[PDB]
Symmetry: C2
């Protein structure tokens, strides 16, 4: 009943998310942040990106049987951040050593041969910053790429390098 | 001082704005924020809203002869914040009494019979929180409708109603 949360996150309900059934909580303050790409279709408008959020979650829940969309957060090319499992629920985006200690954020689209617009990169940053402020993320949080932790191409040839040029990024 | 990687602002260069010729500064920290609407067209995509930002700036410079777009920031229904004259330069949005001591943010569209979507409202409120964070705004800043300091419908009956329910609103 006050001013929304920092980082202009599109809340679950606004993108028509099926309710979550997850219960495992992440222990604030979280140290890690793993970045991946959905490796699916990308979107560049609020309208199209909310649908892509829905489509991604539909896959994870109806088909893979998970309690909710795997990522803690999703980033659209529309420059917005879509709320996934959020800051307090353990995700399912990086496997069994990484999920319990990090927040996973994913870029909607395949970034092997394309980069996300500056606005998406901005939305990504603004998100982590806002994580710190709340306490979800510890001030000196460390950022890994998806391949830095599992055997995968994600976050995509391009997305990867740019991330390497990020302040809080630890190889 | 204390720098925050705060908010996601579409910078001047990005929406392809003409360069500013304004040089007069505001005194940090600012105590007032005047909310207005452009009463012009609305847009719901980064692509459409960037154009729109350029149109408003275009109108204020090429037609009313001001040094740059009159607003310090503009909000899009695409849920993005657009960079105007920013936090440090005085705008022209509310007359000569109120311009030297306030930040003016304008929602792009006519909110007489429409309400801006939640994402617009969120970006505007996030924007404000960042102003505080940076020290651009007082921590006890005050939000005012355009009509509270100038006779006009701005920011539109619907939006005016919404801003009244904001935490920092004093008529």
């Amino acid at each position: 009943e006050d001013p929304p949360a920092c980082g202009s996150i599109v809340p679950r309900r606004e993108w028509r998310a099926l309710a979550s059934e997850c219960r495992e909580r992440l222990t604030r303050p979280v140290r890690y942040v793993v970045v991946s790409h959905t490796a699916g279709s990308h979107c560049d408008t609020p309208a199209s990106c909310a649908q892509q959020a829905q489509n991604v979650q539909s896959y994870h829940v109806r088909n893979l049987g998970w309690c909710d969309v795997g990522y803690n957060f999703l980033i659209g090319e529309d420059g917005l951040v879509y709320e996934g499992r959020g800051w307090n629920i353990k995700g399912a985006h990086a496997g069994p050593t990484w999920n319990p200690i990090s927040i996973g954020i994913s870029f909607m689209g395949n970034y092997m041969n394309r980069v996300p617009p500056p606005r998406a990169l901005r939305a990504a940053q603004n998100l982590l910053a806002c994580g710190v402020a709340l306490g979800a993320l510890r001030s000196n949080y460390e950022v890994k790429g998806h391949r830095d932790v599992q055997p995968t191409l994600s976050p995509g040839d391009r997305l990867y390098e740019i991330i390497q040029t990020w302040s809080h990024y630890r190889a």
